[PDB]
Amino acid sequence: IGTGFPFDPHYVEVLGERMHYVDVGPRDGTPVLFLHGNPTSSYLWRNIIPHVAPSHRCIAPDLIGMGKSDKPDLDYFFDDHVRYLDAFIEALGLEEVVLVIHDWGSALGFHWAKRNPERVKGIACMEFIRPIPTWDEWPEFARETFQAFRTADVGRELIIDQNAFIEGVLPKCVVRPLTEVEMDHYREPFLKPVDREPLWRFPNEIPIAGEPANIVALVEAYMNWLHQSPVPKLLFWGTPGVLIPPAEAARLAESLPNCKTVDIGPGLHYLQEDNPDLIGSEIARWLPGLASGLG
Template sequence: MKHLYAFCAVMVLWTTSMLAQGGSDLDPRIAIKAPQASEFVTVNGSQMHYLTAGSGDPIVFLHGQPTSSYLWRNVMPFLEDQGQVIAPDLIGFGQSDKPDLGYTFQDHYAYIDGFMDALELSDVTLVIHDWGSVLGLTWARENPDRIKAVIFMEALVAPVFPMDDISAFGPFADTFRAFRDAEAGPELLIKQNVFIEQILPTSVLRPLRAEEMDTYRAPFLNEADRKPLLMWPNELPIGGAPARNVAVFEANNAWLTTSETPKLLIYFDPGVLIPPQVAHWIGAHFNNIDIRYGGAGLHFVQEDQPVAIGRISADWLNALAAQ
């Protein structure tokens, strides 16, 4: 995977050029405001926010860094006929509380596990992305009697993670070294807020509208609230550290290769974490998995291809129910 990120760097440059030219016409089905109901539930003494609609077996959408349930707003309507769609904000993200935590993977997992218990969710279909994929796969692995299916995209899985050496990030290696540096990391991720202001908009093919950017900015307007953004890059298992997360990723990858739970990967071109060549590797190595192409996209594919993601997921779940 050494050259994966070099390829994606070219695409980021292409995207920047596209944004400068104004991009292409926007699909009118990409709404600015989330149409789902906004709810809260108490988990581990804190309030966790979630979007929800529909009824029936739960379909739970998990976001990652630096987004929120808002990322899924235009995908969820396509699955409302399949069950109750539920998209929580990770603790410290979106409208969820920001308690005084370390914001390690283990902290986040305690809240997601608690969220599932608080809502008494079973027969769960997970739709997962970025760090939400690690949280979701860990929950699926640890709760085999409560999981029905898993749909994932741009996920943190093999063969990319765990990463043996940070140089595998190619042209982004120095950036991620800086993110994990005790001095440069806080400057970039807390002071400059680069995940929101730079990485997010340049990892979407279309121009994000001002209202959309404002929604993503809203949880992190104050520097004091940005600790979760600093911590996620430091939680990536690179070069054997942190060892506790190497173990999590390896266990999840082993589960993906052996579990009979139905799985769907939706991949995009060029993608970032799962470009087409990685998708083909996954199709050959993970068990009981279907692969579908979702169209053009970089990393935050829900902002470019919500209709494709929604339709592909709904069709796959319909076919699964008919078996």
């Protein structure tokens, strides 16, 4: 698995801040928009993009406050990310797009799709954000850790002071061992502890057991849309997984219209680090069928 990031940097000014993004492949045609989550960046898609670039334009932005994008003094609530991504998409003048999303990138993607259904040609997703009814449904090996992340004071000490999301969660959620260089790529954006704010707000935004109410409502809303939408969907899942265990993927294969599922083998949360080749090749084979004749 490649550890390099052979993509030229591209920047665009959005809401008074500069956002970094990968932009490769053809200059025209339907763009494939890759959205990462916590605590990653476009680096997460480095080994998947090469499978798609030969046939489609690939755009992979670093969310505000992450990767190589600027890091303004925000509280980084989900809403801040929504505003910046909305502006990012309009800044690049994107019309219709195909979404490839993960984790908080999936919450952003699904939310954008719900609000702009006529502009979403297809959605490839994996380990995405959905309402978690109870802590019972959160994987045991990571249960107390996320409960701690959402506990006053304790959570910030772990994530901000100790950088536990980068040093602990990330590596512990890839089946194969991440190498030193890969970890250093992920560590780079957060060498200043204060910049770890988004890494802490994210876990506190996850809809678990009905909290936080505002995010729960927003997520329930896009899931309601997703279940009723005829848009082509491609869901990658692994075993045992985290947010989308095998049993959940099997349920979604039925409850999500026009849905195709792909078993990537062993995987926890950052599936892209365990089987990027299958994810990339399957997306590439899936894209052509999203078209409806010449146009």
